[PDB]
């Protein structure tokens, strides 16, 4: 999920 932020 970190990649979308």
């Amino acid at each position, epitope marked *: *999920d*970190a*990649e*979308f*932020r």
Partner: antibody
Amino acid sequence: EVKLVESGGGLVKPGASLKLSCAASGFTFSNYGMSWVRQNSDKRLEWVASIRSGGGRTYYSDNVKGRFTISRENAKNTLYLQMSSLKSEDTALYYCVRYDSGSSDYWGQGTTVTVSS
Amino acid sequence: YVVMTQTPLTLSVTIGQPASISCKSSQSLLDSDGKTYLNWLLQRPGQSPKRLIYLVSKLDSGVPDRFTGSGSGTDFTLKISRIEAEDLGLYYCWQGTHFPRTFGGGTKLEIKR
């Protein structure tokens, strides 16, 4: 209702290619990041690939990088996972997963990929 | 690579009794934006995973209040105060703070009768 419906799974030989698709409905597809996550026989969950809403940026785990290509066609509300050079370790249930609240929220029903001779 | 260590592996609990699942990460899940991206998910038999909890303690819409997530840094807990039969299945924590996203190995909750 948010709905994610995967298809295109099935039997594929080691080294060969298979393309999965996921049809999204119930939300504005182009506003959401999307990801593929796989689940193995031991029920381990493993992130595979992610793509941002505009399709400009793609992310891959070290396991599939250089082998898989995630993409999306927004006008068709469809997410794709092009798999190539498949390995027996790639055998699993593949889920289409929506990214929101800072996290993944909706999961599809999953499509089964079996890499076998 | 952030290792998510989830315990116990299996849990057997009587209806009406509390259940508690632990999730520990190999690094802090506090992001620099001040938020903590720790999530919990439930996969019931014959069903696709469904999110219960995000940002450590925030309940997904329609999740009953008997579910409560807590913790900070590297130590997190999911507590169910009063177990119902519908709660059975596989629970996973997973983190969205560092790349790549990583999942706990899951905890199978069984109803004891």
